[PDB]
Ligand binder design. Sequence first.
Ligand code: MET
Length: 522
Amino acid sequence: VEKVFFVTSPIYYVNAAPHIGHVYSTLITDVIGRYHRVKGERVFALTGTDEHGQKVAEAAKQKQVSPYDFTTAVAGEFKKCFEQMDYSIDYFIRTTNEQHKAVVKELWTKLEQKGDIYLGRYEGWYSISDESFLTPQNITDGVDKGNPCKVSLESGHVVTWVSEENYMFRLSAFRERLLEWYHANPGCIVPEFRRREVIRAVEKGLPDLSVSRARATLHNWAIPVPGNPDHCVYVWLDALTNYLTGSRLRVDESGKEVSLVDDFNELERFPADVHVIGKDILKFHAIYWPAFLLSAGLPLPKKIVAHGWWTKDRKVFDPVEKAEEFGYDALKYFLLRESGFSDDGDYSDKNMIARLNGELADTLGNLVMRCTSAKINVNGEWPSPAAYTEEDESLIQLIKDLPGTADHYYLIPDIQKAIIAVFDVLRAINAYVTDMAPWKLVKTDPERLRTVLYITLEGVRVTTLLLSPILPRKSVVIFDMLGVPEVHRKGIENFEFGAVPPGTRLGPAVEGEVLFSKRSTE
Ligand code: MET
């Protein structure tokens, strides 16, 4: 099936201004999207805001502002933040959007009509801040901001008791089918240890899920249950549905939603190929969402990838401050290189300088300038290579192999491993150049310099191609410099070694340009 490659971020609670971590979550989505476009696929990257609910209403109340004006305000800050971050996101969805509301009601009725919703009670614990139901096994003693109280073991936020007559979803009726799913498709959750988590959790057992709430308790800031106005639809069913809505909106060039199609198939987007989420919101995506879709008879997503950060809680680092100080591409690169799947990373100013200088400036930067220098490349062109020594071939072989391995990494997706894979190959090219001493060759042996300079150029191109989803602005400056024609800057075709042919002319130089400039160690 050729289809639109559909990738998502989570949609974020608008309770507080956007910080790092939304930025991280959405950057991953952006990168995954960007890569598939570099492959020449159709993409649809979605992101947005989660605007309804108790959490969000009570933040609006605590600021003495109306929910309508509050959400709109904060949503605008999220849009400004993401514009400023220079993502290539295809659409920004809001759950207040009337077309979304329409899809939630539509979905609820599917779920209702299958007989997977019934009127019951939920008498148990709830984290308003997580908008999560919790069994007593996942609460414990702690402090309110300072009295003694019970808190979520998930997040350490304050939980409270809840005894409401609610509409209930038959999640228990879906235990075995989730379990078949998980096993049948072992790629479906990334990273592997969270897949194991999700299975152990569901093995142990699933109770039914309370998919409505008394309207009094939600401050009437939510979507009403179809055919029962005394209730509102659980904020997470509302939130998760953003993906299905997203998959059905027609969007103009300006980024404005213009139409909601009846059948998701019409746009060939649903289901999501990859859902980017933080580890704090796994259950909702890996248990609830599949159960809802299986009820509605909808297709399940292909991949849920849950990165190592929290999606929401501010537990100092301002992206825009750091982006101005170090660079937008540098910051994105640093965040992506440093953060693994279980997050044990160093985000100190010292480390950011070490990597910017070490990797981007010394390994990539230097190398780009060597092969384009007037000193070495005296014709500002791609020379035609002579015969290859077994060293020459050793590196060519690395450069040939890099797209295959970088691709697989991107498809996991483990963007960090992908970056390493490339930079390994960059460090090889430096090593190569150190040996050959191209500076010495331009006098000694011009015939050899051709072979050397050609391989350098083509490695630096192919590495920069595979780096392009991470360093989107700089890859354009690298290609401009190497004089790579615009057609050769994307497509699986141009992952092949030698796509840009000899006798191509390098880009014009500038009197004081440097690609990445070192920052003092202080
Ligand atoms: C359907 S994703 C919803 C995520 C939630 N709004 C959060 O910020 O964590």
